Write a protein that binds this ligand. Structure first.
Ligand SMILES: Nc1cccc2cccnc12
Ligand SMILES: Nc1cccc2cccnc12
Length: 164
């Protein structure tokens, strides 16, 4: 079936717990595969040791810039960027996993987990999964955000990988 992957997250050197994500490879196989391999680190790079750099309460938690660590960077397993696979999955509510981008067809490695229904991103951001377990951790991360997106704690993906 669809891969299950995990992110173990620290805030200020203290463990918050684990976020488990289902990657909808059945709908967006290319997008799912990229995120899966970046969790395992099997291509020589990935999410391990990178941060949630932009968090906005009542909106979303963003991460995945493992090259520049500031929201300008990241890269995919295919190359620096890859196309929007489709917009079939919708931003239906809290727990939705979606690709951050800098406009059409600029997917790399940055992603976000929604804390509300972000329906206005439908057709603009590629949704590729959702939170199976660990919304409690996501709400903690959300609480360390701000209006500007600047985080009030240093939030780090200490470990990540594939469960199935
Ligand atoms: N099937 C699901 C279970 C729990 C949360 C979800 C969030 C978005 C899409 N699907 C979801
Ligand atoms: N892939 C990306 C996602 C979100 C923001 C970005 C900003 C600059 C370059 N790439 C970006």
């Amino acid at each position: 079936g669809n891969p299950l992957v995990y992110l173990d997250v620290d805030a200020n050197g203290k463990p918050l717990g684990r976020v488990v994500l289902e990657l909808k490879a059945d709908v967006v196989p290319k997008t799912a595969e990229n995120f899966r391999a970046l969790c395992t680190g099997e291509k020589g790079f990935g999410y391990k040791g990178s941060t949630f750099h932009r968090v906005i309460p009542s909106f979303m938690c963003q991460a995945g810039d493992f090259t520049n660590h500031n929201g300008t960077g990241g890269k995919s397993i295919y190359g620096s960027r890859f196309p929007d696979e489709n917009f079939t999955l919708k931003h239906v509510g809290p727990g939705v996993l979606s690709m951050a981008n800098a406009g059409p067809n600029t997917n790399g490695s940055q992603f976000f987990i929604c804390t509300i229904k972000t329906d206005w991103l439908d057709g603009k951001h590629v949704v590729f999964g959702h939170v199976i377990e660990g919304m409690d951790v996501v709400k903690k991360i959300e609480s360390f955000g701000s209006k500007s997106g600047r985080t009030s704690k240093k939030i780090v993906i200490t470990d990540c990988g594939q469960l199935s």
